[PDB]
Amino acid sequence: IVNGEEAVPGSWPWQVSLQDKTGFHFCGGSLINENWVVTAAHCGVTTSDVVVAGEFDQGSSSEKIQKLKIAKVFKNSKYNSLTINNDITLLKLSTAASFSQTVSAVCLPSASDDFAAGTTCVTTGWGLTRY
Amino acid sequence: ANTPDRLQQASLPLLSNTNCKKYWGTKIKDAMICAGASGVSSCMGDSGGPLVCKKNGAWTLVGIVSWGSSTCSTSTPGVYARVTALVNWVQQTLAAN
């Protein structure tokens, strides 16, 4: 995020960070249940990857983070790697998360819902704060 | 480095797909929703995370960070996967596994 603000720790509890095997952060994700995460199809997630829930500071010397194994990756078959259209993947947790003051799921909209142009939304992540 | 250790959040307005087309023309397809161009931008590393809006006192997933400005320009709108467009696929998947 460029020009964001620091978040209150644990206030965006479905927020997850995916780490590859070498160990660190390559993408964000959102917990929609205790067993499933949604993220982008462009992230190229594979079962070697791990989902980290409960994180605030990727520096945290140690926290009550939960690292989850990914049982199966579900990549939308319509994903266009040239256009980047249908950018989504579903990740089915080998082991379910344990919901708590800090980890919990976001809600899903219905295909018919209307978020009007001008609506105030919020985006979060650990991406670059400056180019 | 420019990578934060603590989680960032930024509030931003959603855009109409035809205002967005202004900026990106033809690269904006069916399943894409734009937001920003208003002093914030998602940036490398933000990919796959959420774009959420409050509905009925609750946060809902409207976007998935997908691509944007080649420089993270805070004046160009980011492009998110539109959930709306993809949630039937998600629900069927969930219903089925």
């Binding site: 978040a7 209150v8 720790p9 644990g10 206030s11 965006w12 509890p13 929609i32 708590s100 003051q101 800090t102 919990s104 799921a105 976001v106 809600c107 899903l108 919020v122 | 959040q9 959420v52 006192g57 609750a58 946060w59 809902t60």
Partner: peptide
Amino acid sequence: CGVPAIQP
């Protein structure tokens, strides 16, 4: 879903 224990 969607209501954190900790308020943004």
